[PDB]
Structure 1
Amino acid sequence: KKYSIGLDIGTNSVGWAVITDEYKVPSKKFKVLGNTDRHSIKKNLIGALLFDSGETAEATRLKRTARRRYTRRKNRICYLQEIFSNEMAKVDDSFFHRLEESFLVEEDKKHERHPIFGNIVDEVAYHEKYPTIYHLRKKLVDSTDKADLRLIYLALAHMIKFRGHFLIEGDLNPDNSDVDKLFIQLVQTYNQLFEENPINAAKAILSARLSKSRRLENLIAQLKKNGLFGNLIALSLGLTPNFKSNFDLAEDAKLQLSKDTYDDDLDNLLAQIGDQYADLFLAAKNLSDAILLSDILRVNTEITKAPLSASMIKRYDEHHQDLTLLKALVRQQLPEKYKEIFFDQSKNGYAGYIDGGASQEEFYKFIKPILEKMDGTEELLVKLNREDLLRKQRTFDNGSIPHQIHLGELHAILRRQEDFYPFLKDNREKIEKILTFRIPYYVGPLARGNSRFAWMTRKSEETITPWNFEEVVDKGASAQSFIERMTNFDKNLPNEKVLPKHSLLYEYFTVYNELTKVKYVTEGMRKPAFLSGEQKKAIVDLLFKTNRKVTVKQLKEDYFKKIECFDSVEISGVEDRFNASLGTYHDLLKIIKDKDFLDNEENEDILEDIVLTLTLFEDREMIEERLKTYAHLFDDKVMKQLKRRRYTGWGRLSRKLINGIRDKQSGKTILDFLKSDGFANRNFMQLIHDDSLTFKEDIQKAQDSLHEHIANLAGSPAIKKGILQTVKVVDELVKVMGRHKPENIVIEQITKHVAQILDSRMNTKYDENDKLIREVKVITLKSKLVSDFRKDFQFYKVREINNYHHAHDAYLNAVVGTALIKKRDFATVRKVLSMPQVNIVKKTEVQTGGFSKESILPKRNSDKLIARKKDWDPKKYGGFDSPTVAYSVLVVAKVEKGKSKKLKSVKELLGITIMERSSFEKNPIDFLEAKGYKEVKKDLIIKLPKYSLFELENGRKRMLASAGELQKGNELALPSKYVNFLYLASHYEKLKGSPEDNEQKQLFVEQHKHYLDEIIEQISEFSKRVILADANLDKVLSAYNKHRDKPIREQAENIIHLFTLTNLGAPAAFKYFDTTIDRKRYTSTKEVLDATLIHQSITGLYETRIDLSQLG
């Protein structure tokens, strides 16, 4: 018999149904293997399948990059120690040894506990002399005496370990340090350059803690937005720039100094308007420098050389003095809340700030009403209102510090002490290279083959220190392979790489493809005609070689005086402007300035290589090294202006698809047929589908399992899981029907890929004409159709009752698609929409991910603390807790339960965590007997992943969730009249239909009132049978019996809220009217060792029962 399959896809659910021709659902009995006595089970062919949602890979990329950064930081400190070791060995031998075991407790140390100086009096003398590290940095920068070697190492290691960002470009110095002098200098040189209308006329006018747009508004309004001065102000502040109509150039190009391509961009935009304006943009960049050094560096730059250390010690001394002032004020005026502020670690006072765990914002919010309701707090409220009160040094807002500040302080320290230590003067540039070096973003991970993310290549066989980096890795080939490993292959000749977007061949192809299918009508012509090859040649040689953006008005105005000799010409086929344009031709004509050289056909490859070289590389020395092979072709100024050009973009076709293959009947190419065709003017995607030329056979002569094709699809990783489960389910239930392929596959992006993969997987036979025999038929539907079919005949759906709605919607879209294709049945539909047996299957899975929670808890006496290293005991060092279990094992053996080591055959669960599962899979009996068990049964070990299944007495079903945890497994089968009554009573206000029909429905709801009591009886019987949660059941029945006088709609909403008591899955909480009923959690797995484990198939039709009472 014929049969059809219907599906309904989601991101957490797949619903499947099998119908015959008369819209029924075939029941069938199945063979059950195992150890019990049930050997046949009658089941219906309708069901669903549930799984948790898939995850993307963004959460695991950041951890990988963080691991790489921590490894490289440790290696930086190792390089510095390897430098200082030989000179440190003469003054204090075990200094690095004391520095590297500082974490251990006093028992586990092997030296003195004071790491820096060894003894105790030198340690307290050092800590009284320098209260922070910044006092030491200012003392080493400013003074001129020979300091101790350990203090120099400590300062250098502190400024290498934390070294600021690299977002600024070029170089800078803190010599400016003034927002007023630079602004006056910029106004002076603007009045020197432009003298027709000068600037109308500092520190706090541009250094406010507000938005950049409002800062630009109050800075420009006090003295327009389309002005050159205003846009230069927005460029210096860092806002969105524009240079379209102010400079009046020929190309609308912005200029943001924060981005990468700015210096060559400024050098290109300089000569486009004049040899002037150089010192103007230099002063604008210097103002953009000095505004960034304002809000982070507030100190007199003439008093001290190192400004950051001075700013830090200013903040520290300010904190100290207003701490003493606040202590005196709170002790005097309000002597009752003193212990709450300066002693209590629980609240958000000062003790919660420093010693507790409070932030700055919560501390200021707590201390605001205390500081307001007092007397004598005038400056403190101002400092709190500008958020500079009681501040720390290492804060959350030091992300603005550039690396040049630490570089300048390091250079000053190395310049000051180099006379007393010779090897410091010998190795200054080595340590400066240690600080300043970073791996470029196109080289990548410096592997040696065993990575799967690396692409770099080497030129030698040695180790890559930061000093010999440029003489080991080839940077040109690595920077080429960084791009070339990601670009698309051609979708017609899959052994060829695509062209750059701005190559001249690609632009010729697009302009001839757009050109050759346009039509024109003159005054007196009969029919619209195409253009000849001479006409297209005149279009290319005259128009497109001068102006890029061509409107149709320019095309009409050119030839009507020029060559057309006709004024009543309408050009049909083009909407008011073109799309393709020879932009690279125009740019190289502005650069190279020789039209006859670009017109020569013998220079095609030698220029397309230049376009490829300008598309790939970004570093200027690489482009110079790869354009040095063209030195005897142009002038010096041409090569000087040539490497400033930069392009980005990759097209869709290869060079072989436009100039490589040949039509063997005629000997011409595709591009030649675009240029000169004949009296057809055919184009691309018409010249390869025609059977005249040989291009169809050539593209056909240039040509994967299920998982590889699923991974070859494009989308979020949730829908890949969804369509893979869909394909597995439909193949399984094709197999279960005697291996007869179905007739119709009705489905409901999700659909647009599964339709193609199902049509490719089902139909495989060919006819005598080598045509695809449509043995099946894949039909796709829209959701509004099944929604209208649900809502017009009162087939109402309530989402919160159970999980049968997936399978019921699958069956419903199946029957409406089959009845639509084909054209007392409603009795059959209402009969099968109340079947009490649907195969719901939660997909079991082995859990994986992180090892535990990431919070590092402090020490306590308990033994649920996972150690953080090998030799760090958790009772003395803290550690993580709450690990995640991968799967459980069912073990049965003897354990030493007795003072005389008495044996006792026990049987229990055991959670294997994610951290130790490899050691369990390697040697199971040795690890399991090191756990504490003895004399185990080597064959009776059963794996149990998350979401297993267990059948109990009277139909009780529980799903395993952890070592000790269970979840509800059964599903409530409510009759259809109660579902219709609940949907109608829930939607009492929103009618959405006919008003007289709504009045009849309201009279129906008013006629049926005891259905609430019947539903309460139903769910109380169900919860007394399978849930065993009598306390919360008592609470909800008392809450129903109390407020049993409400309106019908509010009562219906409160009833359909409380179905979270009985539905499948994890327990949750709910609220009836005001009483909130907490979730009840089953935390015992003692009963589960006397039940029947069910090994269930993918659709749940094949089963394998296992009686666990017969084991052990």
Structure 2
Amino acid sequence: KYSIGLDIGTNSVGWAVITDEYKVPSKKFKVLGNTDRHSIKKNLIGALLFDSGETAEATRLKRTARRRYTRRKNRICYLQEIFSNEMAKVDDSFFHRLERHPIFGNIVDEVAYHEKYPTIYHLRKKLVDSTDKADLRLIYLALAHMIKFRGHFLIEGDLNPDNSDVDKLFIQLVQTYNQLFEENPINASGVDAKAILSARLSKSRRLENLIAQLPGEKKNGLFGNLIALSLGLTPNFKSNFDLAEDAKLQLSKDTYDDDLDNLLAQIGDQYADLFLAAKNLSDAILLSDILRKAPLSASMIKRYDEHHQDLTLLKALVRQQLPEKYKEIFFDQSKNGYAGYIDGGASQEEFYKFIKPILEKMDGTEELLVKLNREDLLRKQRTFDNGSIPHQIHLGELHAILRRQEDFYPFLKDNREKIEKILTFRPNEKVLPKHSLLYEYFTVYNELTKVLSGEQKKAIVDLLFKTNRKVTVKQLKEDFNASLGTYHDLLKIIKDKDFLDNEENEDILEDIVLTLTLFEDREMIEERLKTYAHLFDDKVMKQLKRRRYTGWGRLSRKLINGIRDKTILDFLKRNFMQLIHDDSLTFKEDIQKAQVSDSLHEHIANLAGSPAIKKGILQTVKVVDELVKVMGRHKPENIVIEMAKNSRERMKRIEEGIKELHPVENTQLQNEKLYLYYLQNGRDMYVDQELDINRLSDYDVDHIVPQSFLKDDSIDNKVLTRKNRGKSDNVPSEEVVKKMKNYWRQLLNAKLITQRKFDNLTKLSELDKAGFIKRQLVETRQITKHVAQILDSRMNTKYDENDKLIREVKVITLKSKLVSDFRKDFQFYKVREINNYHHAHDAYLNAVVGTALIKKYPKLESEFVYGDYKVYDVRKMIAKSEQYFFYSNIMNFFKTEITLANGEIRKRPLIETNGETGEIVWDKGRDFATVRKVLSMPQVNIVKKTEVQTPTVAYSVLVVSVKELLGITIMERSSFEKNPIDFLEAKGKDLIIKLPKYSLFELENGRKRMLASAGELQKGNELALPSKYVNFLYLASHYVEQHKHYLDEIIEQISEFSKRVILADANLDKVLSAYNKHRDKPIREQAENIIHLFTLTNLGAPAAFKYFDTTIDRKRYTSTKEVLDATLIHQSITGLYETRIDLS
């Protein structure tokens, strides 16, 4: 019955709820405060504002080595379960043995394994290529290595030749680069990237070679650095972005993702896709190499073999021609020779610089020198050249091995899909040995829990189970399956009852029995036992080795003794199962959570993005959850999501242009008309009659491919005209005018117009239109796709009997431009500064436009809705003039009237419907009115998220001889969470009243405060400005004039607001005084400055601002005494559920 709209930014999340006719519901919510307000009516439209500070959430959103470790561990734990019962037949202690440390339980097998498989890739390759049956352990090892280091998931489908095409991905890179720099694109022309990047030369040389194809681009240029990143090098991006500190990037470096995030935080998340493109390019360069069995494993083996051939050669040479240097090069390890390279800490570059001269002086062989130049001489296994691998390549080998060994092992046939799913997927402890002292003890105690008093139990163990290997019932009566069989074993060897009986040693002995169970070979057992040798007599040590155990229990050590409350072992010494199943006791609670004992945060943490955007993404999810529960747990039909020098570049272009063939400074060039005046050298694009400044700009401007086919408001599609002379009919600028073109082409050589613009100017097929539609609907930005996926996953959980996913909720991703342009055409104007309502209004508009679009064109669903849907043939939807659309602009149906380029007019029906389903999508009479009404209403839930920090106060608490506010350091809080009263008393009781940062209080004529600190307050109010004034300000700023009397009204409004809530008398007087002086100023200049005046009224920290010549310094609310008698308001994330406190 409803849909959700979402606007997502780095410090805000806008949200709206919408019905079938685009109305925003009103709802009554209960108010849980002690105040005599019990319900409140609120509209389901709002915005959540958040800071980017040090908090628990923030840490949870960062990558951590431990989370990764646990992830991998779990995957392997799942792998081993599939192998368990079958591995039990081959090698019962195999998975317990695994992390030189031995894989196998006997030395013969271990040594043989390492001799046959010097690297894991040898094993992989052999398992991929051999038809012979293989030991299960080997199979496991290969599979486990594949699953452990599965690679990346950047590529969506089963690998195809486009994925390894250097040319195409290079083109992609340039494309994404060009979209981010409209003014100075790079031309792919006919560059043979493939040949330059794939060629076998130095990285630097390949870079330098590639840039030779790009004229006017420097090596240290952004693009050059990106290429250098894709090639394998470590470029520095600080010079490119004017960063204060160093920003070096290397794809091969383990910290790269984090480093990239670090960069993105500074320069903006808008640049993520640009670097992702570079990474993709890198992958292609590597992929084409391994492709031109198991190609990866083979390449690694080749690397290994080359390495050893070269090593032997080099050694021989150095023995022959430079014996003095031999010991140095191959053994010293503190030098930069081969020894330092392998077992020292030496760079490939340090090593190379070290041996470069030695090889040249030697003259034995230059082949090696060539290899050195290529940086392919003595490669190590522990590298990939600026790379993490596509998981698909590991998947291939996985499949191959399984297919190879499935005939010999049926359980592999049966579980194949399962095993694949582990790699592709997107208690903790291992059981004690069966003959462990602790386990044996547990069994006897648990069996003996009943036949009995706690003291007697201990007596009975100490008496019968201890003195006798097996205790029987007759014997018991004189004074039982479970036996302390190991306790007794170890007595005869150790011959010391205390050593056992003392509990402090148990943690040592567990290791001894474990060691005995782990290995079937005296040598190994000895080696491990050597560590505990000092306690033990040498006659004992020899005896210990012969003892061997071959079993595994069902329970872990921590389960038996690790868990709290007494332990299981202690409660036992009731009944174990009953102990597990009692809610009164803590274990049950421990276990149940312990199995699970965060995934969403972890998932968001591994996206490529700043901390802020990640926080945003996190908040959205919570907002959605709450809105769903607000709407009675019914799920929404649709969710629409959107993610919320240049002047100086323009100059460079112009200056570059005139160099081929009066002056203005930069700041002005933002005027499209002036910038266009300069790009064109004051010449009319369309009539060969020169353009001079003051009039013709005002005359007109024109789109090259009109608005009706698509909206391209970029200068790449725009030109300054006389707009009838050039355009003629709607088709691109008419044939008769192309006789003008020589002009344009000169402007091409000058780089004054781009190639595409010229192609369009010289130029409409069905095919173009088809491209044009997809262009306007498909969001390229990766992060939005990830957000979409996350939302879709949370919303759609149920599967039907056919195991197909049930999609209750469609997650729609909207291009920003559609809503921006929707705002343009129908005059729903935005002014960011008056309040924060625009974030909410954006969300509302997103949902409106999105839902309208799916209702109108459901066949295009595949282009902007998450999930897999049929990709219809666009050509069928395009029509001849009379028969969705002949005119390609998708937003056209909103308009009552489409103006063609020639000026001719196409009229549309008042009500727009879907012909196929007959559904009503848009009613121009009612619906636009509703939109305005929705934007016009003054009650919008704006919530500033409360934050707890982790000399900084985590939060302030209200204390009650007197009422006072008290800050809490992070250091103080822990013991405070332990020992409240003694803190509170040491400093100087009903109420625990932690006031998180930004806590909201209200007082007087609806005047609220936010608690920044126990020392300062922030304004707590949103100034609701009537829409008329908003539109007037937008229109006044963007140069009718009969509406000059509204300025005074706006200022009167601001002043009313300020005197009511801001309470900045001295500041306001100056503000008001300033307006009196500058009535003379023109309207534009007049309007722009009243905008700045809004920072006086803005919600948040007080700040300073300049009105014309005058400057108003900020005022701080340094007294927190107001808050103490005020009414606190605890806000939900949506702000819909409130709790209102006021002791007074």
State the alpha-carbon separation in 2 of the partners of residues 762 and 185 from structure 1. 33
State the alpha-carbon separation in 2 of the partners of residues 3 and 174 from structure 1. 43
State the alpha-carbon separation in 2 of the partners of residues 978 and 276 from structure 1. 33
> Structure 1 130/56 Cα, relative in aligned 2: closer, same or farther at 3 Å?
same
3-state DSSP of counterpart to 1:152:
helix
Deviation at 1:1009, TM superposition (A): 0.8
State the alpha-carbon separation in 2 of the partners of residues 929 and 275 from structure 1. 48
> Structure 1 635/306 Cα, relative in aligned 2: closer, same or farther at 3 Å?
farther
Q: Deviation per CA, 1:1010-1062: give whole Å up to 9, x if none.
A: 11111110100000101100000001100111222111111111111121000
Counterpart for residue 239 of structure 2: 245
> Taking structure 2 as the reference length, what is the TM-score of the superposition?
0.37
State the alpha-carbon separation in 1 of the partners of residues 312 and 476 from structure 2. 82
Deviation at 1:924, TM superposition (A): 1.9
Give yes or no for contact 2:1130–2:1139 (8 Å, CA) kept in 1: yes
Give yes or no for contact 1:114–1:123 (8 Å, CA) kept in 2: no
Give yes or no for contact 1:54–1:721 (8 Å, CA) kept in 2: no
**Bigger mean CA offset, 701-710 vs 952-961:** 701-710
3-state DSSP of counterpart to 2:153:
coil
Counterpart for residue 685 of structure 1: 577
**Highest Rg: 1 or 2?**
1
**Bigger mean CA offset, 312-321 vs 235-244:** 312-321
> Structure 1 1076/194 Cα, relative in aligned 2: closer, same or farther at 3 Å?
closer
State the alpha-carbon separation in 1 of the partners of residues 440 and 92 from structure 2. 70
Counterpart for residue 833 of structure 1: 935
> Structure 1 123/1064 Cα, relative in aligned 2: closer, same or farther at 3 Å?
farther
State the alpha-carbon separation in 1 of the partners of residues 838 and 184 from structure 2. 75
Deviation at 1:276, TM superposition (A): 54
Give yes or no for contact 1:1020–1:1033 (8 Å, CA) kept in 2: yes
Deviation at 1:1064, TM superposition (A): 0.6
**Bigger mean CA offset, 816-825 vs 593-602:** 593-602
> Structure 1 3/196 Cα, relative in aligned 2: closer, same or farther at 3 Å?
closer
State the alpha-carbon separation in 2 of the partners of residues 93 and 694 from structure 1. 33
Higher helix share: 2
Give yes or no for contact 1:26–1:44 (8 Å, CA) kept in 2: yes
State the alpha-carbon separation in 2 of the partners of residues 205 and 797 from structure 1. 48
Counterpart for residue 652 of structure 1: 554
1:291 equivalent in alignment to 2:280: no
> Structure 1 400/943 Cα, relative in aligned 2: closer, same or farther at 3 Å?
closer
Q: Deviation per CA, 1:31-72: give whole Å up to 9, x if none.
A: 111311111101111111111136799999999999999999
Q: Deviation per CA, 1:774-819: give whole Å up to 9, x if none.
A: 2221111111111111101111111111100010010001111112
Give yes or no for contact 1:968–1:1066 (8 Å, CA) kept in 2: yes
> Structure 1 598/984 Cα, relative in aligned 2: closer, same or farther at 3 Å?
farther
State the alpha-carbon separation in 1 of the partners of residues 180 and 943 from structure 2. 79
Counterpart for residue 695 of structure 1: 587
Q: Deviation per CA, 1:444-467: give whole Å up to 9, x if none.
A: xxxxxxxxxxxxxxxxxxxxxxxx
Q: Deviation per CA, 1:486-525: give whole Å up to 9, x if none.
A: xxxxxxxxx999999999999999999999999xxxxxxx
Count of residue correspondences: 923
State the alpha-carbon separation in 2 of the partners of residues 427 and 802 from structure 1. 58
Give yes or no for contact 1:56–1:716 (8 Å, CA) kept in 2: no
1:332 equivalent in alignment to 2:320: yes
Deviation at 1:1108, TM superposition (A): 2.5
> Structure 1 12/332 Cα, relative in aligned 2: closer, same or farther at 3 Å?
farther
Identical-pair percentage: 100
Give yes or no for contact 1:950–1:1091 (8 Å, CA) kept in 2: yes
Give yes or no for contact 2:253–2:386 (8 Å, CA) kept in 1: no
State the alpha-carbon separation in 1 of the partners of residues 250 and 1094 from structure 2. 58
1:550 equivalent in alignment to 2:479: no
Counterpart for residue 907 of structure 1: 963
3-state DSSP of counterpart to 1:325:
helix
Deviation at 1:1069, TM superposition (A): 0.6
State the alpha-carbon separation in 2 of the partners of residues 114 and 508 from structure 1. 30
Q: In structure 2, list runs of 5 or more residues that go unmatched.
A: 641-780, 857-925
State the alpha-carbon separation in 1 of the partners of residues 112 and 799 from structure 2. 93
**Bigger mean CA offset, 61-70 vs 409-418:** 409-418
Q: Deviation per CA, 1:158-178: give whole Å up to 9, x if none.
A: 999999999999999999999
> Structure 1 733/544 Cα, relative in aligned 2: closer, same or farther at 3 Å?
same
Counterpart for residue 1141 of structure 2: 1106
Deviation at 1:913, TM superposition (A): 2.2
> Structure 1 135/278 Cα, relative in aligned 2: closer, same or farther at 3 Å?
closer
Deviation at 1:230, TM superposition (A): 24
Q: In structure 1, list runs of 5 or more residues that go unmatched.
A: 99-111, 299-304, 439-494, 519-530, 558-577, 676-681, 849-882, 893-904, 933-937, 989-1004
Q: Deviation per CA, 1:323-357: give whole Å up to 9, x if none.
A: 99999999999999999999999999999999999
State the alpha-carbon separation in 2 of the partners of residues 193 and 836 from structure 1. 37
State the alpha-carbon separation in 1 of the partners of residues 272 and 584 from structure 2. 61
Deviation at 1:939, TM superposition (A): 2.3
Deviation at 1:315, TM superposition (A): 52
State the alpha-carbon separation in 2 of the partners of residues 816 and 182 from structure 1. 33
State the alpha-carbon separation in 2 of the partners of residues 147 and 325 from structure 1. 35
Deviation at 1:117, TM superposition (A): 63
> Structure 1 1034/160 Cα, relative in aligned 2: closer, same or farther at 3 Å?
farther
State the alpha-carbon separation in 1 of the partners of residues 186 and 932 from structure 2. 83
Give yes or no for contact 1:341–1:350 (8 Å, CA) kept in 2: yes
Give yes or no for contact 2:465–2:484 (8 Å, CA) kept in 1: yes
**Bigger mean CA offset, 217-226 vs 1082-1091:** 217-226
3-state DSSP of counterpart to 1:252:
coil
Give yes or no for contact 2:230–2:281 (8 Å, CA) kept in 1: yes
State the alpha-carbon separation in 2 of the partners of residues 256 and 131 from structure 1. 29
Give yes or no for contact 2:359–2:365 (8 Å, CA) kept in 1: yes
State the alpha-carbon separation in 2 of the partners of residues 192 and 731 from structure 1. 35
State the alpha-carbon separation in 2 of the partners of residues 192 and 1051 from structure 1. 35
Q: Deviation per CA, 1:640-665: give whole Å up to 9, x if none.
A: 999999999999999999999999xx
> Structure 1 645/39 Cα, relative in aligned 2: closer, same or farther at 3 Å?
same
1:174 to 161, 179, 194: 161
3-state DSSP of counterpart to 2:163:
coil
Give yes or no for contact 1:1068–1:1080 (8 Å, CA) kept in 2: yes
Deviation at 1:241, TM superposition (A): 16
Deviation at 1:218, TM superposition (A): 24
3-state DSSP of counterpart to 1:47:
strand
Taking CA–CA contacts closer than 8 Å with sequence separation of 6 or more, which of the two structures ends up with the larger relative contact order? 2
Counterpart for residue 731 of structure 2: none
> Structure 1 6/309 Cα, relative in aligned 2: closer, same or farther at 3 Å?
closer
Deviation at 1:916, TM superposition (A): 2.3
State the alpha-carbon separation in 1 of the partners of residues 439 and 328 from structure 2. 75
3-state DSSP of counterpart to 2:967:
strand
Q: Deviation per CA, 1:690-713: give whole Å up to 9, x if none.
A: 999999999999999544544465
State the alpha-carbon separation in 2 of the partners of residues 183 and 772 from structure 1. 36
3-state DSSP of counterpart to 1:916:
helix
Give yes or no for contact 2:202–2:375 (8 Å, CA) kept in 1: no
> Structure 1 272/654 Cα, relative in aligned 2: closer, same or farther at 3 Å?
farther
> Structure 1 690/131 Cα, relative in aligned 2: closer, same or farther at 3 Å?
closer
State the alpha-carbon separation in 1 of the partners of residues 68 and 517 from structure 2. 30
> Structure 1 983/930 Cα, relative in aligned 2: closer, same or farther at 3 Å?
same
State the alpha-carbon separation in 2 of the partners of residues 548 and 772 from structure 1. 59
> Structure 1 14/174 Cα, relative in aligned 2: closer, same or farther at 3 Å?
closer
State the alpha-carbon separation in 1 of the partners of residues 937 and 1034 from structure 2. 19
> Taking structure 1 as the reference length, what is the TM-score of the superposition?
0.38
Give yes or no for contact 2:13–2:48 (8 Å, CA) kept in 1: yes
Deviation at 1:602, TM superposition (A): 53
**Bigger mean CA offset, 342-351 vs 209-218:** 342-351
> Structure 1 543/362 Cα, relative in aligned 2: closer, same or farther at 3 Å?
same
Q: Deviation per CA, 1:681-733: give whole Å up to 9, x if none.
A: x9999999999999999999999954454446554433332222111111111
3-state DSSP of counterpart to 2:161:
coil
Counterpart for residue 891 of structure 1: 959
Give yes or no for contact 1:296–1:401 (8 Å, CA) kept in 2: no
Give yes or no for contact 1:4–1:745 (8 Å, CA) kept in 2: yes
Deviation at 1:830, TM superposition (A): 1.0
Q: Deviation per CA, 1:291-341: give whole Å up to 9, x if none.
A: 99999999xxxxxx9999999999999999999999999999999999999
State the alpha-carbon separation in 1 of the partners of residues 457 and 1080 from structure 2. 86
> Structure 1 538/835 Cα, relative in aligned 2: closer, same or farther at 3 Å?
farther
> Structure 1 1019/424 Cα, relative in aligned 2: closer, same or farther at 3 Å?
closer
> Structure 1 186/644 Cα, relative in aligned 2: closer, same or farther at 3 Å?
farther
Give yes or no for contact 1:1093–1:1108 (8 Å, CA) kept in 2: no
State the alpha-carbon separation in 2 of the partners of residues 196 and 22 from structure 1. 41
Give yes or no for contact 1:331–1:338 (8 Å, CA) kept in 2: yes
Deviation at 1:768, TM superposition (A): 3.9
